[PDB]
Amino acid sequence: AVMVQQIEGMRDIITEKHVWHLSDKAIKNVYMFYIMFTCWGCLYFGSAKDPFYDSEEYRGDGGDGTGYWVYETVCISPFLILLGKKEKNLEMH
Amino acid sequence: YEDSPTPVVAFLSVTSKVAASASATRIFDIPFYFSSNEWHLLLEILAILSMIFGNLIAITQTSMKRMLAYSSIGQIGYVIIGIIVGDSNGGYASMITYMLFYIAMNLGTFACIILFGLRTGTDNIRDYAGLYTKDPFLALSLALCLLSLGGLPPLAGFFGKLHLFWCGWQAGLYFLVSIGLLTSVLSIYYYLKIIKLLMTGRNQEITPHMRNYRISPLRSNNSIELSMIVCVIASTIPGISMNPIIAIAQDTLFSF
Amino acid sequence: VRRCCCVISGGVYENLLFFPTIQLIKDRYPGVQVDILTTERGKQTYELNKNVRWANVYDPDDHWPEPAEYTDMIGLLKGRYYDMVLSTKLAGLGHAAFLFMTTARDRVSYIYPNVNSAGAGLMLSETFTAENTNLSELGYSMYTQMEDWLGRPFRSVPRTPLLPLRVSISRKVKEVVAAKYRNAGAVTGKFIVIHGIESDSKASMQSKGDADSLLSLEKWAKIIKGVRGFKPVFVIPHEKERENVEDFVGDDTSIVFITTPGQLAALINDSAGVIATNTAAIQLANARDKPCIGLFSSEEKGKLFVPYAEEKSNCVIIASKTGKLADIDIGTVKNAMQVFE
Amino acid sequence: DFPWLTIIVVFPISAGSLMLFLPHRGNKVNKWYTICICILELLLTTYAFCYNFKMDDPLIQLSEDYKWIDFFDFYWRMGIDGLSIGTILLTGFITTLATLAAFPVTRDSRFFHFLMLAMYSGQIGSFSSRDLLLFFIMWELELIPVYLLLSMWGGKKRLYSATKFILYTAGSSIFLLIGVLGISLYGSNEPTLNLELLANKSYPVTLEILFYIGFLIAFAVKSPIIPLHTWLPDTHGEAHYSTCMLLAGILLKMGAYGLVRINMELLPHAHSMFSPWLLVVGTIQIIYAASTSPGQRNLKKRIAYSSVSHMGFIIIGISSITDPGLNGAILQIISHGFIGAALFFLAGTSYDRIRLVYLDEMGGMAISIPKIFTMFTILSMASLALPGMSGFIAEFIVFFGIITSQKYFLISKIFIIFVMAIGMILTPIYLLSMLRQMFYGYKLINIKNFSFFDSGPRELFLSISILLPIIGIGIYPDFVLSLASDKVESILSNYFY
Amino acid sequence: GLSQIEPDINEDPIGQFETNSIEMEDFKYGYYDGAHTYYEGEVQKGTFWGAIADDIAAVDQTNGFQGLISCMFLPAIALGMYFDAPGEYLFIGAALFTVVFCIIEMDKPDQPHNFEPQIYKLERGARDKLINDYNTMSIWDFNDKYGDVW
Amino acid sequence: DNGFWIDGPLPIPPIYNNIVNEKTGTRTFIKKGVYVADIGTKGRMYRVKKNAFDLLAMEDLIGPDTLNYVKKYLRLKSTFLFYDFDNLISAAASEDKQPLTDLANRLFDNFEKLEDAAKTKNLAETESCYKDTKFLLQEVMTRMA
């Protein structure tokens, strides 16, 4: 572990070189513990009060959980107001 | 096939094509083998054309029986690959099992098109939009049958096309197999274009023929649905359970 | 037909003057789910139709779109399964293929007069060769070929107009524009819109064929000082003009920021007078029988963009003797006093 | 001994097929049923990986062979390499967190979570199969379900992107089928499909180059290679966050892993001909996909091109005929799996909160959503190849495999390293442009009346759970190298002689 | 967001690259960026345990038992090492925990944010899937507005 | 041999006429591809010392369920030592050449024994071989220094 190395320019070096490794089993065990932590969180925080996707902000307007609900909504509500406008013109504005 | 009633469209399309494939094996391999070079080219041309234009027409068709006819043209174009290969370098077993799957996965599609037309009335394709909400089972059956016809996952028509292209590659028909695969993708497009409609729905993209579907005002649980679910099963599992069908189709070596 | 597309273009004005055509379509056949594939600034006008369904945004006069967008809209028009198209994009080949790629039974379109329509007849059911290549320069009608084809005599009468330009406002736009002019110094009954201001903006709803359509402010200051105030509310196309208008006509004058033509029509319906220059405000005033005067740069453009001035009996049309929109600013005041009260 | 990999692969489908009708018409029941199934499957995967997988032996473990179709010699070959177990655990982790992120979906959530489990089975089937035609089956089995959870969930022009993706991927899977047909039929006497029996064949160069073309056109779209990469910016950029975090997380890695299985150790003498050009392609790919990303106003297409850029290092490590190069390729597969997954997750949640897409709009939202801001910043740093994150050690070990390459010479190594490391100047540009456009600033119209909701505990756990392996692999890379490196030698032993 | 009317198009597409922030001319330093806010005196107590447990209680759907097992799960796996080395017992217990949690997450409350977007019309409290097994209410057709007020 | 990217076999580095090999084959701890930098005779003489010091300070790494990393570090640093001894022998003074190559042979036979003990997950034999290979590592370290 201890080695003295001579160098012309500056000084001597007292290298130590603790060659180690986590080991094959401990690596498997940290994979195990992190997957178990992922299980615990996936269940618990999945059972947490998700404050955004519960209120009338998301779930109110549309809120299906898609990414086209905004665009299909603002493409439908024009159609709904146009249909209500035709219904209003059906009964003399 | 647009004018004729849907059930006999199914019967005559599938039955005439399987009988004419029996003849197109019989009157070509037995009496016309001496000129089998020239003959092959003819069928090859037709096969390539029947693989392309059919699967290239039904993309831009608004009807349903009509684009089913063109998809059937494409499927028979795949069948001519197994017609071209002889009995030795990949036999007629691929053609046989593909006609089996073609029956099983086209009569199911025609059964779903029949039930959509005995409950809605029409056969235009834009009326299919919204079937997933009214009828999840019929929509699932038609989607599974069309996916068998296109053949993305391990269904009947996928593995049938796989056997055909296997025999074609092994015999050395590269321009048949490559074009057939191109047009298989080209058919996957319009099959999913159908599956777009009977999975989507927006309360106005549906029609007033889909809005009033009325499954329950019916005689009973019909025997139409019995053959429909039989065809769905026979388009799903025989892709998986294919080894018995290959083994019972390989012992037809006496066609000469 | 059952579903009908529309690939129109031009902006605010040209999308507005297509409402007679869409009402004609819905009068010809009982039930038509109409769709519009127009440019931005054109979809907004389609709040005021009560006869349309989707009104997507395409800008068909791009000529060089993103192939992603091009193929997306091609497949969209395919998957909506139309039976008629009725472009009035004014292009032949290239665009004729864009209408043909849509599974449409009756492809209808306009056509360049030049050689650019080399093969449009191979894909279209109707030709509709046009004039001036700048169809809005043709004037208010702009669609007489499209109209005199739509509902031709086959069984019954055409009835190509239905009391032309019945625009219609919703209650939400009415409420928000009411809050807008009440935040201004105006009352719902006694106020007058303007909608002519020198700007550099596409929200003034001018045209594609008129360049000297928007009048200056110092000349507008002289116009509005010549008239006693019936509280003229100013309709700017952009906020940068507000601090300009207050610098010209005075801080006391009330300005209302309207860029949406639906909000503009909601302003018109509550207004009791219109002093518009050649914008969409004139036609929105002729809609709902509101009294306009309608300044113009020439009697030719005035007759072209207002041919039916003798039918509403309130829109006393005004023009300029010479060009360049240098009008009298004297007699316009006189018949403004006549018609507004 | 025991059918392990089979009950890994079939279990998501065989447990989602229990949702035939299941009359529970809220998203709660099927959401929890399927996250429970995904956790169970992940735990089965780990118990196969921990107590029944020797990490030193660079051979097939948990092998399993049946007979499906005798005519093709088509078996149910299953097997785990050193270069495939990491992708399998990544599939488990990322798809599990994807169905966690899909908790708020309620449109047709039964069908959504079933198709998620179908992808969950198909991806592990593609990674665990040692049969060529089965690799094709599980390649095309993750084609329809992704289409159905891409066209009906997420994205404005979702239909265009979905049909583009499905037809592009099918038009490349046919090239894959040409390849497996070529190898199986024209491979040798006694035609077979088992890759374990197949990796020690002759394959003369005039035929090996043909197979390599037939497989490279297949894997050039899944790991996007810049002639054939246009499906991604439409597909990812117009998909939901839960689907997109496995479209980039694990679906992009097949094709990179495939270039290791059926190209690197099945066609080695042809890869020695083609890798010199794949190197130039990857070096141009990094710069191209890092220069297109500032070109994108969109937020999500920026990250799609970011994935096209970070796949360039995997292309380079694969085309680097070295142990460091390929180990860096596998490590970058896993690292960018985590990174792109969490980045697409955060971009989707940012779109859900803000409801703006383009970076011209969407100015300063850091005070509105600070948790999203910090997680996006940390994961942009991980995308940046920043030390302390796995991206650095990946995008450095690939460099080290270049500079220690025996194939290439210094006249080429200099140019390659130069064009590679311009990538890490251009990557700061687009990533921190995204950050300063979408988070740094103040919008006077957004003062208090909006008051958007911050990252809830679920989304925070998503981002943190994908972060901790990135940090753990940046501080100790042998969580990923040690499971592959031995196998990598079993690759390179086929190359040096 | 909602945008019942069509929004106004911005005539100034500020730029492809530069952010959408206000300029330094109009930036009130200190108050906006928080560089001179936070005058201590308006702050509150709750030193690190009266605000952690407050935050845990702020976001939680865990009852007495589900939740107690959640608190004791990760300590059980953490003591799966450094106290013993059971092996497969850990994974069998973790699967048991997941399955019993999912069975528990078939909650008696149904919390209407779980349901489809089309359900949000009004009066949805009268809808009670919470108690009514085999609901039998054909409202999920989503093609016509039925009156479910009975 | 087209300048950039020599193609085909990807050759190994050669063995220049030395008896440093095993005579029942070449050698078994040889890593196939490693970039041994052609520094120079003083640089090789010092890098032998450094790699031998590494293999010497690999004492902590050895233990139960860790022999794979032992084998990997062994074959790596022994491949470095192999090519460095090859360049040192090939550039020796022809009077210290024979003792140095006999030293390398009796060192590499022990590295082979150590790799055979560690690849087979034999811990006790690994350590019992590590004893005399540590003697040899200190021997080469005090030779090069």
mmCIF file of N, CA and C in Angstrom, chain A:
data_model
loop_
_atom_site.group_PDB
_atom_site.id
_atom_site.type_symbol
_atom_site.label_atom_id
_atom_site.label_comp_id
_atom_site.label_asym_id
_atom_site.label_seq_id
_atom_site.Cartn_x
_atom_site.Cartn_y
_atom_site.Cartn_z
ATOM 1 N N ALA A 1 0.826 -1.197 0.000
ATOM 2 C CA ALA A 1 0.000 0.000 0.000
ATOM 3 C C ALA A 1 0.865 1.252 0.000
ATOM 4 N N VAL A 2 1.801 1.343 0.934
ATOM 5 C CA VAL A 2 2.669 2.511 1.005
ATOM 6 C C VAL A 2 3.820 2.328 0.028
ATOM 7 N N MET A 3 4.046 3.340 -0.805
ATOM 8 C CA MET A 3 5.149 3.349 -1.751
ATOM 9 C C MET A 3 5.769 4.734 -1.767
ATOM 10 N N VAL A 4 7.094 4.782 -1.707
ATOM 11 C CA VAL A 4 7.855 6.013 -1.872
ATOM 12 C C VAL A 4 8.344 6.067 -3.310
ATOM 13 N N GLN A 5 8.065 7.177 -3.988
ATOM 14 C CA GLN A 5 8.407 7.362 -5.392
ATOM 15 C C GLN A 5 9.288 8.592 -5.530
ATOM 16 N N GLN A 6 10.452 8.412 -6.141
ATOM 17 C CA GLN A 6 11.389 9.500 -6.370
ATOM 18 C C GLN A 6 11.059 10.191 -7.684
ATOM 19 N N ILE A 7 11.088 11.520 -7.664
ATOM 20 C CA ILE A 7 10.859 12.340 -8.846
ATOM 21 C C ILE A 7 11.915 13.433 -8.858
ATOM 22 N N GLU A 8 12.476 13.697 -10.038
ATOM 23 C CA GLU A 8 13.586 14.637 -10.137
ATOM 24 C C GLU A 8 13.148 16.046 -9.766
ATOM 25 N N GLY A 9 11.988 16.470 -10.255
ATOM 26 C CA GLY A 9 11.588 17.853 -10.131
ATOM 27 C C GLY A 9 11.213 18.308 -8.737
ATOM 28 N N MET A 10 10.072 17.842 -8.228
ATOM 29 C CA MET A 10 9.469 18.488 -7.068
ATOM 30 C C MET A 10 9.819 17.834 -5.737
ATOM 31 N N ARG A 11 9.382 16.598 -5.511
ATOM 32 C CA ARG A 11 9.407 16.022 -4.169
ATOM 33 C C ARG A 11 9.202 14.511 -4.272
ATOM 34 N N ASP A 12 9.042 13.865 -3.118
ATOM 35 C CA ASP A 12 8.733 12.448 -3.004
ATOM 36 C C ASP A 12 7.238 12.271 -2.780
ATOM 37 N N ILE A 13 6.721 11.118 -3.203
ATOM 38 C CA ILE A 13 5.297 10.810 -3.145
ATOM 39 C C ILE A 13 5.104 9.520 -2.356
ATOM 40 N N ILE A 14 4.083 9.506 -1.499
ATOM 41 C CA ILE A 14 3.872 8.479 -0.479
ATOM 42 C C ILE A 14 2.563 7.742 -0.750
ATOM 43 N N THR A 15 2.296 7.462 -2.029
ATOM 44 C CA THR A 15 1.077 6.798 -2.493
ATOM 45 C C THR A 15 0.652 5.641 -1.592
ATOM 46 N N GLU A 16 -0.666 5.460 -1.468
ATOM 47 C CA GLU A 16 -1.281 4.495 -0.560
ATOM 48 C C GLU A 16 -2.067 3.405 -1.279
ATOM 49 N N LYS A 17 -2.961 3.774 -2.196
ATOM 50 C CA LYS A 17 -3.582 2.848 -3.146
ATOM 51 C C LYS A 17 -4.369 1.739 -2.438
ATOM 52 N N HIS A 18 -5.435 2.166 -1.769
ATOM 53 C CA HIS A 18 -6.421 1.243 -1.211
ATOM 54 C C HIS A 18 -7.330 0.756 -2.337
ATOM 55 N N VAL A 19 -6.888 -0.296 -3.025
ATOM 56 C CA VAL A 19 -7.723 -0.907 -4.054
ATOM 57 C C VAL A 19 -8.836 -1.688 -3.373
ATOM 58 N N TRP A 20 -10.074 -1.280 -3.625
ATOM 59 C CA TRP A 20 -11.247 -1.876 -3.020
ATOM 60 C C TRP A 20 -12.314 -2.031 -4.086
ATOM 61 N N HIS A 21 -13.472 -2.545 -3.651
ATOM 62 C CA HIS A 21 -14.667 -2.629 -4.530
ATOM 63 C C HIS A 21 -15.873 -2.885 -3.619
ATOM 64 N N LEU A 22 -17.070 -2.456 -4.028
ATOM 65 C CA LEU A 22 -18.299 -2.694 -3.223
ATOM 66 C C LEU A 22 -18.518 -4.203 -3.099
ATOM 67 N N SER A 23 -18.183 -4.983 -4.140
ATOM 68 C CA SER A 23 -18.318 -6.471 -4.178
ATOM 69 C C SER A 23 -19.563 -6.880 -4.971
ATOM 70 N N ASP A 24 -19.564 -8.097 -5.520
ATOM 71 C CA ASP A 24 -20.686 -8.550 -6.387
ATOM 72 C C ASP A 24 -21.994 -8.617 -5.598
ATOM 73 N N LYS A 25 -21.952 -9.126 -4.363
ATOM 74 C CA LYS A 25 -23.212 -9.318 -3.597
ATOM 75 C C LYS A 25 -23.751 -7.968 -3.113
ATOM 76 N N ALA A 26 -22.882 -7.074 -2.629
ATOM 77 C CA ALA A 26 -23.396 -5.803 -2.061
ATOM 78 C C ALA A 26 -24.020 -4.955 -3.172
ATOM 79 N N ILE A 27 -23.495 -5.050 -4.395
ATOM 80 C CA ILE A 27 -24.088 -4.345 -5.527
ATOM 81 C C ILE A 27 -25.493 -4.875 -5.783
ATOM 82 N N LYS A 28 -25.648 -6.198 -5.768
ATOM 83 C CA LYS A 28 -26.982 -6.772 -5.863
ATOM 84 C C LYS A 28 -27.871 -6.303 -4.721
ATOM 85 N N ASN A 29 -27.303 -6.131 -3.528
ATOM 86 C CA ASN A 29 -28.114 -5.759 -2.375
ATOM 87 C C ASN A 29 -28.559 -4.306 -2.450
ATOM 88 N N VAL A 30 -27.729 -3.427 -3.007
ATOM 89 C CA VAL A 30 -28.165 -2.042 -3.156
ATOM 90 C C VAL A 30 -29.163 -1.923 -4.298
ATOM 91 N N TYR A 31 -29.016 -2.734 -5.351
ATOM 92 C CA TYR A 31 -30.092 -2.837 -6.332
ATOM 93 C C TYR A 31 -31.380 -3.282 -5.656
ATOM 94 N N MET A 32 -31.278 -4.268 -4.765
ATOM 95 C CA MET A 32 -32.444 -4.781 -4.057
ATOM 96 C C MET A 32 -33.079 -3.688 -3.213
ATOM 97 N N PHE A 33 -32.271 -2.994 -2.414
ATOM 98 C CA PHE A 33 -32.824 -2.002 -1.508
ATOM 99 C C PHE A 33 -33.416 -0.834 -2.266
ATOM 100 N N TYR A 34 -32.812 -0.442 -3.387
ATOM 101 C CA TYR A 34 -33.386 0.660 -4.137
ATOM 102 C C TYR A 34 -34.668 0.252 -4.843
ATOM 103 N N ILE A 35 -34.760 -0.987 -5.322
ATOM 104 C CA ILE A 35 -36.016 -1.430 -5.915
ATOM 105 C C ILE A 35 -37.099 -1.513 -4.849
ATOM 106 N N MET A 36 -36.734 -1.932 -3.638
ATOM 107 C CA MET A 36 -37.712 -1.978 -2.558
ATOM 108 C C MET A 36 -38.147 -0.576 -2.162
ATOM 109 N N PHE A 37 -37.219 0.379 -2.201
ATOM 110 C CA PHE A 37 -37.568 1.770 -1.943
ATOM 111 C C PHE A 37 -38.472 2.309 -3.038
ATOM 112 N N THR A 38 -38.240 1.881 -4.278
ATOM 113 C CA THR A 38 -39.114 2.289 -5.367
ATOM 114 C C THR A 38 -40.509 1.722 -5.178
ATOM 115 N N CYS A 39 -40.603 0.469 -4.740
ATOM 116 C CA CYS A 39 -41.898 -0.111 -4.397
ATOM 117 C C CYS A 39 -42.594 0.706 -3.319
ATOM 118 N N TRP A 40 -41.871 0.996 -2.235
ATOM 119 C CA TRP A 40 -42.464 1.713 -1.115
ATOM 120 C C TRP A 40 -42.972 3.072 -1.553
ATOM 121 N N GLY A 41 -42.181 3.787 -2.347
ATOM 122 C CA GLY A 41 -42.599 5.105 -2.775
ATOM 123 C C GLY A 41 -43.719 5.056 -3.793
ATOM 124 N N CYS A 42 -43.643 4.116 -4.739
ATOM 125 C CA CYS A 42 -44.673 3.974 -5.755
ATOM 126 C C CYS A 42 -46.022 3.712 -5.127
ATOM 127 N N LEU A 43 -46.036 3.000 -4.007
ATOM 128 C CA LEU A 43 -47.284 2.721 -3.319
ATOM 129 C C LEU A 43 -47.711 3.884 -2.431
ATOM 130 N N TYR A 44 -46.788 4.396 -1.620
ATOM 131 C CA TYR A 44 -47.139 5.404 -0.631
ATOM 132 C C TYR A 44 -47.433 6.746 -1.285
ATOM 133 N N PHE A 45 -46.469 7.294 -2.028
ATOM 134 C CA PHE A 45 -46.694 8.565 -2.697
ATOM 135 C C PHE A 45 -47.737 8.443 -3.795
ATOM 136 N N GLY A 46 -47.944 7.238 -4.327
ATOM 137 C CA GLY A 46 -49.107 7.006 -5.159
ATOM 138 C C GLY A 46 -50.396 7.149 -4.381
ATOM 139 N N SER A 47 -50.375 6.778 -3.100
ATOM 140 C CA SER A 47 -51.481 7.009 -2.179
ATOM 141 C C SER A 47 -51.347 8.330 -1.430
ATOM 142 N N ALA A 48 -50.747 9.339 -2.049
ATOM 143 C CA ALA A 48 -50.654 10.674 -1.482
ATOM 144 C C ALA A 48 -51.651 11.600 -2.160
ATOM 145 N N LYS A 49 -51.951 12.699 -1.478
ATOM 146 C CA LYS A 49 -52.884 13.688 -1.995
ATOM 147 C C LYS A 49 -52.239 14.480 -3.119
ATOM 148 N N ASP A 50 -52.347 13.986 -4.341
ATOM 149 C CA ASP A 50 -51.775 14.685 -5.478
ATOM 150 C C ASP A 50 -52.537 15.989 -5.680
ATOM 151 N N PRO A 51 -52.016 17.143 -5.248
ATOM 152 C CA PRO A 51 -52.880 18.325 -5.158
ATOM 153 C C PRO A 51 -53.244 18.922 -6.497
ATOM 154 N N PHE A 52 -52.423 18.726 -7.529
ATOM 155 C CA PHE A 52 -52.725 19.326 -8.819
ATOM 156 C C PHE A 52 -53.815 18.549 -9.543
ATOM 157 N N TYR A 53 -53.597 17.255 -9.767
ATOM 158 C CA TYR A 53 -54.579 16.431 -10.467
ATOM 159 C C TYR A 53 -55.692 15.931 -9.555
ATOM 160 N N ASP A 54 -56.282 16.813 -8.749
ATOM 161 C CA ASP A 54 -57.487 16.515 -7.982
ATOM 162 C C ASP A 54 -58.492 17.663 -8.046
ATOM 163 N N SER A 55 -58.007 18.888 -8.235
ATOM 164 C CA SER A 55 -58.826 20.078 -8.091
ATOM 165 C C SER A 55 -59.606 20.356 -9.372
ATOM 166 N N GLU A 56 -60.409 21.415 -9.336
ATOM 167 C CA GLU A 56 -61.166 21.861 -10.497
ATOM 168 C C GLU A 56 -60.304 22.590 -11.518
ATOM 169 N N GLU A 57 -59.008 22.754 -11.258
ATOM 170 C CA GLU A 57 -58.120 23.314 -12.267
ATOM 171 C C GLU A 57 -57.866 22.300 -13.374
ATOM 172 N N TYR A 58 -57.366 21.121 -13.009
ATOM 173 C CA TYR A 58 -57.140 20.067 -13.990
ATOM 174 C C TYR A 58 -58.421 19.288 -14.253
ATOM 175 N N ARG A 59 -58.978 18.667 -13.212
ATOM 176 C CA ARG A 59 -60.139 17.806 -13.396
ATOM 177 C C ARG A 59 -61.397 18.581 -13.753
ATOM 178 N N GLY A 60 -61.415 19.892 -13.547
ATOM 179 C CA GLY A 60 -62.607 20.655 -13.841
ATOM 180 C C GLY A 60 -62.823 20.915 -15.313
ATOM 181 N N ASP A 61 -61.867 21.591 -15.950
ATOM 182 C CA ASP A 61 -62.028 22.009 -17.336
ATOM 183 C C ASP A 61 -62.155 20.796 -18.248
ATOM 184 N N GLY A 62 -61.067 20.046 -18.389
ATOM 185 C CA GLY A 62 -61.087 18.698 -18.913
ATOM 186 C C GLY A 62 -60.591 17.761 -17.839
ATOM 187 N N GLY A 63 -59.330 17.377 -17.958
ATOM 188 C CA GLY A 63 -58.625 16.684 -16.912
ATOM 189 C C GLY A 63 -58.546 15.190 -17.056
ATOM 190 N N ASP A 64 -58.655 14.671 -18.272
ATOM 191 C CA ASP A 64 -58.584 13.232 -18.469
ATOM 192 C C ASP A 64 -57.223 12.661 -18.101
ATOM 193 N N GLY A 65 -56.183 13.489 -18.088
ATOM 194 C CA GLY A 65 -54.817 13.046 -17.915
ATOM 195 C C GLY A 65 -54.013 12.963 -19.192
ATOM 196 N N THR A 66 -54.595 13.330 -20.326
ATOM 197 C CA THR A 66 -53.910 13.294 -21.606
ATOM 198 C C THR A 66 -53.106 14.581 -21.782
ATOM 199 N N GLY A 67 -52.632 14.815 -22.998
ATOM 200 C CA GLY A 67 -51.968 16.042 -23.386
ATOM 201 C C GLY A 67 -52.709 16.759 -24.495
ATOM 202 N N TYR A 68 -53.717 16.102 -25.073
ATOM 203 C CA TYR A 68 -54.579 16.687 -26.086
ATOM 204 C C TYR A 68 -55.904 17.165 -25.520
ATOM 205 N N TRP A 69 -56.120 17.039 -24.210
ATOM 206 C CA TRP A 69 -57.384 17.487 -23.645
ATOM 207 C C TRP A 69 -57.512 18.998 -23.710
ATOM 208 N N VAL A 70 -56.399 19.717 -23.579
ATOM 209 C CA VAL A 70 -56.435 21.168 -23.727
ATOM 210 C C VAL A 70 -56.854 21.534 -25.139
ATOM 211 N N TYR A 71 -56.213 20.917 -26.126
ATOM 212 C CA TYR A 71 -56.430 21.320 -27.505
ATOM 213 C C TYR A 71 -57.786 20.850 -28.011
ATOM 214 N N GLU A 72 -58.180 19.619 -27.687
ATOM 215 C CA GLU A 72 -59.514 19.185 -28.071
ATOM 216 C C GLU A 72 -60.587 19.939 -27.304
ATOM 217 N N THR A 73 -60.298 20.381 -26.074
ATOM 218 C CA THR A 73 -61.300 21.188 -25.319
ATOM 219 C C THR A 73 -61.473 22.552 -25.994
ATOM 220 N N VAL A 74 -60.368 23.262 -26.236
ATOM 221 C CA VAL A 74 -60.466 24.574 -26.879
ATOM 222 C C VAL A 74 -60.778 24.459 -28.364
ATOM 223 N N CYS A 75 -60.872 23.243 -28.898
ATOM 224 C CA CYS A 75 -61.454 23.001 -30.211
ATOM 225 C C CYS A 75 -62.916 22.587 -30.139
ATOM 226 N N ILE A 76 -63.366 22.108 -28.983
ATOM 227 C CA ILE A 76 -64.755 21.716 -28.786
ATOM 228 C C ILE A 76 -65.588 22.869 -28.242
ATOM 229 N N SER A 77 -65.068 23.627 -27.279
ATOM 230 C CA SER A 77 -65.868 24.686 -26.680
ATOM 231 C C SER A 77 -66.182 25.778 -27.701
ATOM 232 N N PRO A 78 -65.328 26.052 -28.699
ATOM 233 C CA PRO A 78 -65.834 26.819 -29.845
ATOM 234 C C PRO A 78 -67.021 26.160 -30.510
ATOM 235 N N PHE A 79 -66.969 24.844 -30.708
ATOM 236 C CA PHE A 79 -68.095 24.157 -31.327
ATOM 237 C C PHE A 79 -69.317 24.174 -30.422
ATOM 238 N N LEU A 80 -69.125 24.065 -29.105
ATOM 239 C CA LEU A 80 -70.280 24.105 -28.213
ATOM 240 C C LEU A 80 -70.921 25.483 -28.192
ATOM 241 N N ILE A 81 -70.119 26.552 -28.200
ATOM 242 C CA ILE A 81 -70.739 27.870 -28.259
ATOM 243 C C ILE A 81 -71.369 28.113 -29.621
ATOM 244 N N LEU A 82 -70.812 27.546 -30.691
ATOM 245 C CA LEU A 82 -71.431 27.696 -32.002
ATOM 246 C C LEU A 82 -72.751 26.936 -32.069
ATOM 247 N N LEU A 83 -72.816 25.774 -31.420
ATOM 248 C CA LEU A 83 -74.052 25.004 -31.384
ATOM 249 C C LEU A 83 -75.100 25.701 -30.528
ATOM 250 N N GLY A 84 -74.688 26.257 -29.389
ATOM 251 C CA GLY A 84 -75.610 27.036 -28.583
ATOM 252 C C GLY A 84 -76.069 28.291 -29.293
ATOM 253 N N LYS A 85 -75.216 28.849 -30.147
ATOM 254 C CA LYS A 85 -75.593 30.012 -30.939
ATOM 255 C C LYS A 85 -76.606 29.642 -32.009
ATOM 256 N N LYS A 86 -76.439 28.475 -32.627
ATOM 257 C CA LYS A 86 -77.443 28.006 -33.570
ATOM 258 C C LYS A 86 -78.750 27.691 -32.864
ATOM 259 N N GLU A 87 -78.680 27.202 -31.628
ATOM 260 C CA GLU A 87 -79.896 26.975 -30.859
ATOM 261 C C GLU A 87 -80.564 28.287 -30.478
ATOM 262 N N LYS A 88 -79.771 29.331 -30.243
ATOM 263 C CA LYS A 88 -80.336 30.643 -29.951
ATOM 264 C C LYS A 88 -80.987 31.246 -31.191
ATOM 265 N N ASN A 89 -80.329 31.134 -32.347
ATOM 266 C CA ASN A 89 -80.934 31.557 -33.606
ATOM 267 C C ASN A 89 -82.115 30.686 -34.012
ATOM 268 N N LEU A 90 -82.226 29.474 -33.465
ATOM 269 C CA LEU A 90 -83.392 28.641 -33.730
ATOM 270 C C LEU A 90 -84.643 29.224 -33.086
ATOM 271 N N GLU A 91 -84.482 29.967 -31.989
ATOM 272 C CA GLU A 91 -85.576 30.576 -31.242
ATOM 273 C C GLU A 91 -85.467 32.098 -31.262
ATOM 274 N N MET A 92 -85.086 32.652 -32.414
ATOM 275 C CA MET A 92 -85.081 34.096 -32.652
ATOM 276 C C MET A 92 -84.162 34.831 -31.672
ATOM 277 N N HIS A 93 -82.866 34.529 -31.783
ATOM 278 C CA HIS A 93 -81.773 35.142 -31.005
ATOM 279 C C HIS A 93 -82.100 35.400 -29.534
#
